[PDB]
Design a protein around this nucleic acid. Structure first.
Ligand SMILES: [Mg+2]
Ligand SMILES: [Mg+2]
Ligand SMILES: [Mg+2]
Ligand SMILES: [Mg+2]
Ligand SMILES: [Mg+2]
Ligand SMILES: [Mg+2]
Ligand SMILES: [Mg+2]
Ligand SMILES: [Mg+2]
Ligand SMILES: [Mg+2]
Ligand SMILES: [Mg+2]
Ligand SMILES: [Mg+2]
Ligand SMILES: [Mg+2]
Ligand SMILES: [Mg+2]
Ligand SMILES: [Mg+2]
Ligand SMILES: [Mg+2]
Ligand SMILES: [Mg+2]
Ligand SMILES: [Mg+2]
Ligand SMILES: [Mg+2]
Ligand SMILES: [Mg+2]
Ligand SMILES: [Mg+2]
Ligand SMILES: [Mg+2]
Ligand SMILES: [Mg+2]
Ligand SMILES: [Mg+2]
Ligand SMILES: [Mg+2]
Ligand SMILES: [Zn+2]
Lengths: 152, 108, 48, 45
RNA sequence: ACCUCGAUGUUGGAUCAGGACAUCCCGAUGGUGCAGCCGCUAUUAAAGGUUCGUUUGUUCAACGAUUAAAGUCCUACGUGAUCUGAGUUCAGACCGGAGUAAUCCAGGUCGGUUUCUAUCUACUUUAAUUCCUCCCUGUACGAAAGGACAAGAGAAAUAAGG
RNA sequence: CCUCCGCAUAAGCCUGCGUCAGAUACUGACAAUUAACAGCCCAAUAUCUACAAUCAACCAACAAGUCAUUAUUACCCUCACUGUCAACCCAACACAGGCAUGCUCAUAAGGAAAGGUUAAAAAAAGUAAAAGGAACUCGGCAAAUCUUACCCC
RNA sequence: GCUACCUAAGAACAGCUAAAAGAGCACACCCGUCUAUGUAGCAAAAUAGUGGGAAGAUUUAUAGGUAGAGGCGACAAACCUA
């Protein structure tokens, strides 16, 4: 029975789970785009958002500095976290990460996903785009909208 | 426990050809409008993703060459500039990664 | 006012930089050793 | 616990089943003769 | 001595229990050497229940405290491809005894390997009982001793389901 | 993140993750380990050799102990041979076992428990547990604590 | 070349308490008390925990010796290539 359990059981235990997520998140902070098993990316997305929030908190915040020191195993990324990512997202309030499924791993056919920080310098992902507004159905719905607006 | 009798090929065929065993046809496959290769609707296109990954690998190799060593991550934003392209006012004050090729059409 | 942690390699990781940092830890113990006897002992104890 | 009863050592090997020891006694000479008659490629050890 | 010795694993316990009624308790009923309270006996009733401990391998027995009661059995003395091996005539050993000795004793005692990944069958979500408290009541009954029913009210305990 | 380790010698094995090319830690070819380390010794005939070791000094010993030459005769005039690799041996196996010694006594050296997901039962290992504290059980087995006294042999 | 015993000449035994000890706690090392797992297993006797000894009647590397009407044995009819 796992009603309400929100954390996956990963690695060799709770500590190993935290360390795996920490390594994935350090890689994400360094490269701004990381491909990894789908479940691990899903688990680490929340921690990535939380680091962005802690970076928003600021350098002077000792709690934020301690959190960054723990979570970024490569200490050169803490200045990055506090001076490149948080300033980038200062305007935003959330949704700093884009996660998209990827064709299964060639080795073990594992469900993989790519997670990136939005606005990175890397080439854009082939994002799935909704159907154009000029399609038949979309044009009919536009006619509906125009008729309703004219009525009101 | 050991089998009491050999199970016949008829029973075995029943078991291993029960539709629960058979592979299910997938109806979520579709053509990628960009390159025309097949892709699952929810999954990203393999061909396009490989294009992006190879371009990312080139850019990252240039990034590593410019960094010159471990633990040298910049404290400023980064911009990738291709041949025949000059930094803009926004690009000013950002680390320039120069790629020795024309900017990909998909890349913007 | 911002106390960034030092940008050094991990002392326990499996990497070239980590190995160099462990070598630095060894050499720091050698430096901290006061007596020349202790210095020589630390410098020559590992037989390779 | 068992199985590793063979603790190899060339000194013991040659002193127990060598050509010299086999020829030392008439019985070992007959052992070598039997091996030769059978056509063994290895008369002694 | 009829199946099984090209193996049907066999005491007691744990676990889960299916069934019988020749009913231990709860229900109804006849008789009584049934005044009442306890009882005894017989008919009907197997829906439900039928305790925890000390020594002992004990099943049982005795004892302690309870209970409404702590039922008799069958089920390979149910159930070891679910479990335990304390007893129990494998290998070691001691005591008493037998024998010249080897060795033995339905004598004691200390120790002593519990296999199996399930092919088939079968199966895997099918209106509750009881005790006690008060009151009736110190009433009916009875010389006293003692001492009820029924009705009513309240509390619980267990079982099932959440 | 782990580190029982690890590096050498011995013993064992005998080219057994060096390069190239083919396949699909395999096959074929090419290469390699260079002695100072170690092994491989000693001209005779007699003749000597009571007094441990233990920091050898006090002491204490008992179980009474690895460590020595002289005399004469011969004799120099001319640095060979062999081991040197490896991820390795004995266990039918890339076997959780066996495996001597010197250093390292936690490491400078050596390694990776997780193929991916889910987080059903049963099973194994571990941790925590209201009140109680052996009522379990053959037996305090196990676990937790660190705990008295009496018997048999 | 295992094992029983022996022969030659070797090696090992941290630390603490005590003091010249078949002394105590305790590593390495040797063993294998009890539990669990395993039972075609990692293993034709192992693993984890726990435990006995651990300066001695100790453990152990090398070479040699005793051979089946036998050897060897602190007798368990032990061990003598599963
Ligand atoms: Mg897992
Ligand atoms: Mg041996
Ligand atoms: Mg018969
Ligand atoms: Mg007859
Ligand atoms: Mg049969
Ligand atoms: Mg009846
Ligand atoms: Mg019977
Ligand atoms: Mg028994
Ligand atoms: Mg006797
Ligand atoms: Mg017994
Ligand atoms: Mg015992
Ligand atoms: Mg069993
Ligand atoms: Mg089963
Ligand atoms: Mg692994
Ligand atoms: Mg798995
Ligand atoms: Mg408790
Ligand atoms: Mg008891
Ligand atoms: Mg007690
Ligand atoms: Mg009991
Ligand atoms: Mg115990
Ligand atoms: Mg000592
Ligand atoms: Mg002692
Ligand atoms: Mg005897
Ligand atoms: Mg006997
Ligand atoms: Zn595409």
């Amino acid at each position: 029975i796992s009603h309400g359990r929100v954390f996956r059981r990963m690695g060799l235990g709770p500590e190993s789970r935290i360390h795996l997520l920490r390594n994935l998140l350090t890689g994400l902070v360094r490269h701004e785009r990381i491909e990894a098993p789908w479940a691990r990316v899903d688990e680490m997305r929340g921690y990535a958002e939380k680091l962005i929030d802690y970076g928003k908190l600021g350098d002077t915040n000792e709690r934020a500095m301690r959190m960054a020191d723990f979570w970024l195993t490569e200490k050169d990324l803490i200045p990055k976290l506090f001076q490149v990512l948080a300033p980038r997202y200062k305007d935003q309030t959330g949704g700093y990460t884009r996660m998209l499924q990827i064709p299964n791993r060639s080795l073990d056919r594992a469900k993989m996903a790519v997670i990136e920080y939005k606005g990175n310098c890397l080439p854009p992902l082939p994002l799935p785009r909704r159907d154009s507004h000029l399609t038949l159905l979309n044009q009919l719905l536009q006619g509906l909208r125009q008729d309703l607006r004219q009525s009101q | 426990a050991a089998p009491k009798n050999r199970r016949t090929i008829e029973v075995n065929r029943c078991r291993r050809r029960n539709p629960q065993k058979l592979i299910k046809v997938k109806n979520n496959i579709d053509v990628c409008p960009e390159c025309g290769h097949l892709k699952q609707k929810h999954v990203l296109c393999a061909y396009c993703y490989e294009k992006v990954c190879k371009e990312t690998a080139e850019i990252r190799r240039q990034i590593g060459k410019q960094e010159g060593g471990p633990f040298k991550a910049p404290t400023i934003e980064t911009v990738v500039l291709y041949t025949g392209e000059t930094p803009s006012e926004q690009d000013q004050g950002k680390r320039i990664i120069e790629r020795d090729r024309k900017r990909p059409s998909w890349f913007t | 006012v911002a106390r960034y942690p030092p940008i050094v390699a991990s002392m326990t990781a499996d990497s070239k930089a980590a190995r160099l940092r462990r070598i630095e830890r060894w050499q720091a113990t050698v430096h901290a050793a006061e007596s020349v006897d202790e210095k020589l002992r630390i410098l020559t104890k590992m037989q390779f | 616990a068992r199985g590793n009863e063979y603790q190899p050592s060339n000194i013991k090997r040659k002193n127990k089943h060598g050509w010299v020891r086999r020829l030392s006694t008439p019985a070992g000479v007959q052992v070598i003769l039997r091996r030769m008659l059978k056509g063994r490629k290895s008369l002694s050890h």
